[PDB]
Design a protein around this ligand. Structure first.
Ligand code: 2M8
Ligand code: 2M8
Ligand code: MG
Ligand code: MG
Lengths: 253, 253
């Protein structure tokens, strides 16, 4: 079994804390179950949470592996080897400029905003916003509701793909949590361990995640995507419930 | 006679060129008629256009006078004396955070944007955008068309004022082109010369300018406000006609 999990609103709360999920995560580790973050966050953000590779960043845009991963792939970067799946940021920002001209109105993203503004909009510290701005593949957009559809089609018009991370729309191309997961499983050292995958998420950008796993669990608010398991409570309480009710009993085998 | 004039859309075309207004300006200067810019632009932008004081920046937020001005007012700053009429930008920005909390939606201004983003939205070069970002009083807002009214209501509810400069809304407190023109006329070294004021402009933020002068001329598009002259063509072509057909005859008598 491998557990692929979203971070904010799934494994972490609004404080960015594990809360009730901490005990659940410790139990999975005690049982030798790999837990792989699959997140909209940048590498810098993931590193700041103290998370170790392997992990998936920017909605599936990049797959980070330990420098010494048994199965060769990617490019050496310090204590990392990196695999790229989606288009590069500065190029995405280029299609956005094209979409802007098509839509006849500004389309703003994190790239257009100062760290101070990003911090204000997200409630992060300035340092944390600097990390959130350090994007390699995916752009986080700051759209107003009425233009949303207008902008989204304009995005779709110029061949960009969009998703929604729970609070913000994102623009990218080739960045897909399900695609990233599929690739990581294909690159797993122990094919037997990767044979059964679990996916936990809370937002639209986790739909691809759910479709790439064998047991999907939705811990978001409202109704879960079709066929996906739900939990009585959202977020970390959901994570904990999912581990206790759904995962632990299967591992007793 | 003092000629108070807006810059963009009045004296300058959409490319920032004088166009047909150049000979008109030269004629005024050759005849010793003071021409005083009264603009939404910052002091840095005005300087980059090669304009010497006196001039009025940021929608009336500040009056910049030659330091050797015979009527000592305001405070010395390098080669100028500055009369501050409006809240400082830092105070406006802080109050904008409150309007934003009230509105429940981001309210972005130039202060939130990179020079690169401001350049893109205005068609300015990056260097020009840096100058437009160097604001001392007034904030330029970048609002969703659909959110404008809610935002303007929020600004007012938290004690800020707003205007529109032709393309963008602005937020400030105490910046008014009319108040600024009145103050400058009151500070003029030669009261006789200040007794008759001409005002030329093209946008909402110029309506106070028209009220503060004795001969008002609108060179924007569509019909002029009540009590304000129109010209056959808008922009610098209107400035030229105004100088040739309205001002130079007044002067000759
Ligand atoms: O998509 C969103 O709604 C959130 C949650 O996934 O992610 C964005 O916003 C987060 C902060 O709220 C950042 O940490 C991420 O990098 C990203 O920019
Ligand atoms: O208000 C507007 O519609 C324009 C018209 O001059 O002024 C803003 O926009 C201009 C660029 O278009 C800047 O030069 C000014 O500083 C200001 O930010
Ligand atoms: Mg999430
Ligand atoms: Mg104008």
């Amino acid at each position: 079994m491998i557990v692929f999990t979203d971070l904010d609103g799934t494994l972490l709360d609004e404080r960015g804390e594990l809360g009730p999920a901490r005990e659940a995560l410790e139990r999975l580790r005690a049982l030798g179950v790999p837990v792989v973050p699959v997140t909209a966050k940048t590498r810098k953000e993931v590193e700041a949470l103290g998370l170790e590779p392997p992990f998936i960043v920017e909605n599936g845009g990049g797959l980070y592996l330990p420098r010494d991963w048994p199965v060769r792939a990617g490019r050496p970067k310090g204590g990392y080897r990196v695999v790229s799946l989606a288009w590069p940021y500065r190029k995405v920002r280029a299609r956005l400029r094209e979409a802007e001209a098509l839509a006849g109105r500004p389309i703003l993203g994190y790239g257009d905003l100062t760290a101070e503004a990003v911090a204000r909009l997200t409630g992060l510290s300035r340092e944390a916003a600097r990390r959130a701005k350090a994007r390699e593949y995916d752009e986080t957009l700051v759209l107003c509701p009425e233009e949303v559809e207008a902008v989204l089609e304009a995005l779709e018009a110029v061949g960009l793909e969009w998703t929604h991370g729970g609070r913000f729309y994102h623009a990218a191309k080739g960045a897909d949590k399900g695609r990233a997961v599929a690739r990581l499983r294909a690159l797993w050292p122990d094919p037997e361990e990767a044979r059964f995958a679990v996916g936990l998420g809370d937002s639209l950008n986790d739909l691809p995640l759910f479709r790439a796993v064998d047991l999907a669990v939705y811990v978001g608010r409202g109704d879960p995507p079709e066929g996906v398991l739900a939990t009585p409570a959202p977020g970390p309480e959901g994570f904990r419930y999912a581990v206790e009710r759904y995962l632990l009993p299967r591992l007793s085998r």
